[PDB]
Every structure is written in structure tokens, then in C-alpha cells.
Amino acid sequence: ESADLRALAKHLYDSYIKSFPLTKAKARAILTGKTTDKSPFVIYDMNSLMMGEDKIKFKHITPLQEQSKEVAIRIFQGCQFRSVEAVQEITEYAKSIPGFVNLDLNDQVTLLKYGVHEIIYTMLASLMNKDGVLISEGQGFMTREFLKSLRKPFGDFMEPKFEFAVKFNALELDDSDLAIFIAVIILSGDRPGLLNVKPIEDIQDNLLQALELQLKLNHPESSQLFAKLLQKMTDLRQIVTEHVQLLQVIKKTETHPLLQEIY
Amino acid sequence: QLNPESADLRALAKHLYDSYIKSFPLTKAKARAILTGKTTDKSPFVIYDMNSLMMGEDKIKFKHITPLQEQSKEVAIRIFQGCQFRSVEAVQEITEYAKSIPGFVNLDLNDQVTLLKYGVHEIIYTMLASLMNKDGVLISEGQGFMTREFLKSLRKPFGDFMEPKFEFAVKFNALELDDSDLAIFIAVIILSGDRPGLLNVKPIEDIQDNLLQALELQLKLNHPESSQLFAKLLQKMTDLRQIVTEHVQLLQVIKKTETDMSLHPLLQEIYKDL
Numbered sequence: 038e039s040a041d042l043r044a045l046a047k048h049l050y051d052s053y054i055k056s057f058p059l060t061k062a063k064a065r066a067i068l069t070g071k072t073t074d075k076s077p078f079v080i081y082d083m084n085s086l087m088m089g090e091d092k093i094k095f096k097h098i099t100p101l102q103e104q105s106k107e108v109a110i111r112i113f114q115g116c117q118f119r120s121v122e123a124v125q126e127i128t129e130y131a132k133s134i135p136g137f138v139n140l141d142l143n144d145q146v147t148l149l150k151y152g153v154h155e156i157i158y159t160m161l162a163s164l165m166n167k168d169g170v171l172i173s174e175g176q177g178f179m180t181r182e183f184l185k186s187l188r189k190p191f192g193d194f195m196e197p198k199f200e201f202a203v204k205f206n207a208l209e210l211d212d213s214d215l216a217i218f219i220a221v222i223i224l225s226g227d228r229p230g231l232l233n234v235k236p237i238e239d240i241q242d243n244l245l246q247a248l249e250l251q252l253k254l255n256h257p258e259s260s261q262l263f264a265k266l267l268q269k270m271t272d273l274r275q276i277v278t279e280h281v282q283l284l285q286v287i288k289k290t291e292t293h294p295l296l297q298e299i300y
Numbered sequence: 301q302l303n304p305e306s307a308d309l310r311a312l313a314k315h316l317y318d319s320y321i322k323s324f325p326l327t328k329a330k331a332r333a334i335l336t337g338k339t340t341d342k343s344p345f346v347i348y349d350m351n352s353l354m355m356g357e358d359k360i361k362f363k364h365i366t367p368l369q370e371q372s373k374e375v376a377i378r379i380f381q382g383c384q385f386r387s388v389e390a391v392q393e394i395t396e397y398a399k400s401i402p403g404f405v406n407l408d409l410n411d412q413v414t415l416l417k418y419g420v421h422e423i424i425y426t427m428l429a430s431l432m433n434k435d436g437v438l439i440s441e442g443q444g445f446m447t448r449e450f451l452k453s454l455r456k457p458f459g460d461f462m463e464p465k466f467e468f469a470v471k472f473n474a475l476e477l478d479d480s481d482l483a484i485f486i487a488v489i490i491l492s493g494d495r496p497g498l499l500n501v502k503p504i505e506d507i508q509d510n511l512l513q514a515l516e517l518q519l520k521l522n523h524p525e526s527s528q529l530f531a532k533l534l535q536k537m538t539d540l541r542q543i544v545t546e547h548v549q550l551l552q553v554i555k556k557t558e559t560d561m562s563l564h565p566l567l568q569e570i571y572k573d574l
């Protein structure tokens with residue numbers, strides 16, 4: 038049924054673009070030249086960040102008064118706001134994956150709950166390079182060295198992912214490939230608390246076929262790509278528990294009685 | 301049917317299965333023939349308590365897995381000293397298995413040592429799975445069987461080193477893999493490239509790309525019904541990591557709780573900034 042897989046690939050790609058504003062393609066051009074011609078505001082140091090707040094006016098996160106008086110905190114604060122946006126973008130895409138909405142409600146919640154981080158890192162890679170990462174709509178670009186520049190637990194917190202980004206992007210996958218790759222991550226049957234694994238596994242099984250095919254056609258040239266891709270999930274889990282430990286440390290910091298609530 | 305290029309890969313599969321057998325005494329075929337009690341000559345002595353723990357050392361072979369030492373007042377540790385030496389032995393075998401992997405000895409010496417460094421544990425847990433069933437694991441090479449419940453009780457930290465294993469084992473054994481499969485898979489594992497500090501990474505990838513192809517053909521030929529087993533097996537590699545990680549974690553605590561216990565240079569050198 039290799040007529041079914043190619044149609045399931047298109048559907049997911051179609052849905053991936055509707056649910057996600059900044060594609061991997063759009064993101065790439067901006068890290069190179071066909072910037073539309075409208076280049077991104079490079080945040081390279083303190084004064085570039087400060088000035089950043091009003092030019093790119095990512096004053097969605099930065100608004101809130103009583104707090105924003107210690108730079109790196111206002112930035113982490115940022116990474117959180119956008120992550121919350123993304124999680125609703127992921128949830129929506131998810132609901133586009135055939136069979137998902139038909140699963141036991143709890144499991145949908147459960148698969149989403151345990152799979153959004155793996156998916157946020159995966160796409161964060163679509164938007165970063167060895168030296169930097171696109172922020173807010175693609176308007177900005179925060180430097181890698183400026184990130185290590187942050188002090189306390191912040192200094193290195195992003196550096197883990199930069200290393201993961203390089204390796205992952207070396208695979209040179211495009212959105213066409215990522216849409217399917219993301220459907221697989223969600224349909225993971227080893228998520229704790231699941232109640233009906235058979236359905237989920239069957240779905241991922243059909244997704245893994247559609248991906249294997251996608252990769253063969255999209256990259257005849259590259260051998261065993263499918264295999265190196267599945268192997269990356271090992272990095273992702275490992276990267277996701279670590280980030281989960283730094284959270285632990287920042288919780289040796291002081292960071293409203295309705296903000297932490299949402300998050 | 302079998303195109304020239306594919307036939308070239310079957311050769312590889314048969315060469316590793318051959319080197320695998322020749323390097324590992326207790327294969328999965330033997331281990332299952334023991335665990336599934338299809339025998340009256342291959343019956344293991346079960347250890348599910350101190351009593352039989354005492355019975356076991358008397359009954360089954362034991363040229364001191366736990367070397368020179370009078371009964372170090374605690375079983376949970378005796379088991380561990382033995383469960384330690386046993387691993388150093390596996391790295392030995394695994395190291396010999398590697399050498400047979402085509403192109404592996406032809407690599408920068410420094411890289412060989414690193415491919416193992418990271419690959420040795422992911423492999424020990426893969427194979428240890430062959431010696432397990434939901435209820436326990438074989439010891440002494442089939443001669444004994446230590447029940448999963450006895451272990452889980454050992455004590456304070458010591459009763460926590462084995463759950464992850466049984467946890468993986470039952471899920472991994474679920475794939476129903478056989479020796480000729482494991483041999484190729486374990487070769488892939490060693491031949492990573494995604495391993496840290498690997499000086500020359502390219503050559504590693506060219507060898508793995510091959511091992512991965514061999515595994516792909518093998519699994520399809522050996523499991524015509526197993527839909528996407530190739531993939532399902534590759535994902536299991538992530539479980540392999542959490543197990544290793546979590547272990548390292550447990551070991552450090554243990555490196556503080558028990559001041560008189562000894563690791564092993566080799567075991568420590570793997571963990572040495574792992």
C-alpha cells in the first residue's frame with residue numbers, strides 16, 4: 038500500500054505547515070540570505086538584548102511589570118512563554134495525525150504530556166545553527182556565545198542543545214521529513230500511564246513506514262538515514278532529562294501570583 | 301531475488317553471528333533452553349532467599365566470583381562484588397567480539413577505546429536480557445537462577461540495581477530476538493560515531509551504515525511477519541541509555557554509602573567522565 042504512505046506523508050506535511058508558523062525552510066533562508074531581504078535583529082550582547090525588547094518588541098513575554106529587573110531571568114521567562122505557544126501548536130498538529138483523536142482521551146493527554154519536549158527540541162533545531170538561534174517569529178537571532186555569556190545556571194543551559202542541534206541538522210531533514218518524524222514521537226507507546234498501547238503502536242507503525250519511505254525518496258542519496266534519525270531519539274530523551282534537572286537547580290533561585298500558575 | 305549487493309551483506313551477518321558464538325559462551329539459545337526447563341540435565345539451582353543463598357554457594361560452581369574475602373558480612377554486597385567481576389569479564393568478551401567487526405581494528409587506536417567505553421554497557425544490558433525472564437536471571441552461566449524478588453530486597457541501595465534491567469528485559473525480550481539478530485545489533489551499538497570525543501568519526505559511520513544494512517536485511521529475512529522490527533529495535537537503544545545513565549547514578553551514591561567497597565579500575569575508567 039505504498040500509495041497510502043505517500044498520501045499520509047502529504048497530509049501530515051500539509052498539517053505541519055498550518056500548525057507551525059516558522060517552517061524549517063523559512064528558518065533556513067533567514068540563517069543565510071533570502072531573508073525576504075528583511076534581516077533579523079541580532080541580539081549579541083546586553084545592549085543588543087535591551088534594545089531587542091523594543092525593536093522586535095517581543096513584549097508579549099517581556100511585558101509583566103513587578104519582576105523584569107534581572108536580564109537572564111527575563112530571557113528564561115521568555116523561553117517559557119514561547120514554549121507555551123508551541124505546546125498548543127503541537128497539540129493542534131497532533132490532532133491532525135490520523136487515529137489520534139480516536140484514542141482514549143486520557144492517552145491523548147498522556148502522549149502529548151510526555152512528548153512535547155522531545156518535539157520542542159527537535160524543532161528548536163530547525164531554528165538554530167552552530168552560532169545562533171532565531172527568536173520571536175524569526176525576527177530576531179540570539180547568539181550562541183551570548184547565551185553562555187549568561188551567568189548562574191543560565192550560562193550553560195542552551196549549550197547542551199546547540200550541540201544537539203548541530204548533530205541533528207547534519208541529517209539535513211526538511212519539513213516534509215519532520216512532519217512525519219514528529220508524528221512518530223507523539224505516537225510513542227512507552228509513555229508511562231498509557232491505557233491502550235495497541236492502537237498507539239499500530240499508528241506509530243504506519244507512521245514509521247511513511248517516514249522510511251519519505252526518507253528513501255527525499256534522499257535516495259543518503260543511505261540508512263531512517264536509521265540514524267531513529268537513533269537521534271536517544272539524544273533527545275537524554276537531553277530532555279538533563280534540562281529537567283537544571284530546572285531543579287534554577288529552583289535555588291527566586292522567580293507574579295498568577296504567572297507560575299499558568300506555567 | 302538475492303541481488304549481488306544483498307548477498308554481500310548476508311556474508312557479513314553470518315560472519316558476525318559466527319564471531320558472536322565464538323566469543324560468548326552463554327548464547328541466548330542456550331539460556332532459553334535452560335530457563336524454559338526443557339531439560340533434566342540443564343536445571344538451574346534457584347536462589348530466592350538467604351537459605352538457598354547459602355544452598356547455592358554450596359551447590360553451584362563458585363571459584364570466588366567475589367575474590368579473596370571471607371563472607372563480607374553482607375549478602376547484598378557479596379552478590380555485588382560477584383556481579384562486578386562478572387562484568388569485567390563481559391567487557392573482555394565484548395572486546396574480543398569487537399575485534400572481529402570488519403574495519404574495527406583498522407581504526408585509530410584512541411577511537412577503538414572510546415567506541416567500547418560507551419558501547420560496553422549498552423551491550424551488557426542487551427545481552428543480560430537474554431539471561432532474564434519476568435521472574436529472574438541466570439548466574440554462573442546457566443547453573444543458577446536468582447529470583448527477581450530476592451534481588452529487589454537485597455537492601456538500601458543494593459535492592460535497586462536490578463529493577464531497570466528486568467524492566468527493559470521483559471520489553472526487549474518481547475521483540476523475540478535471536479542470537480544471529482543480536483550479533484548484528486550489538487555490532488551497530490559499538491560502531492556509534494555519536495560517541496563523544498571520537499577523533500575520526502567518518503570511518504565509524506561508514507562501517508555502521510553497513511552494520512545497519514546487515515541488520516535491516518537480517519531482521520526482514522528472520523522475521524517476515526515482524527512489522528517494522530528494524531525500527532522498533534533501534535528505538536530500544538534509548539532504553540539502553542537510561543539504564544546505563546541511571547546505573548552511573550546509583551554507583552556514585554554507593555561510592556559514598558559504603559566506604560569499604562571497591563569498584564574496579566576498568567569499571568571506573570568506563571564511568572570516568574562518562
Ligand SMILES: *C(/C=C\CCCCC)=C1/C(=O)C=C[C@@H]1C/C=C\CCCC(=O)O
Binds near residue numbers: 059116123158160
Ligand atoms: C524553553 C525552556 C523550557 C520549556 C518548558 C519546560 C517544561 C518542563 C525550551 C528550550 O530551551 C528548549 C526548547 C524550548 C524553547 C522554546 C521554543 C522553541 C521554538 C521552536 C519552534 O516552535 O519553532
Ligand SMILES: *C(/C=C\CCCCC)=C1\C(=O)C=C[C@@H]1C/C=C\CCCC(=O)O
Binds near residue numbers: 424438551
Ligand atoms: C550483575 C548481576 C547479575 C548478572 C548475572 C549473570 C552472569 C552470567 C548486574 C547486571 O547484569 C546488571 C548490573 C550488574 C553488572 C553491570 C555493571 C557493573 C557495574 C557498573 C554499574 O552499573 O555500576
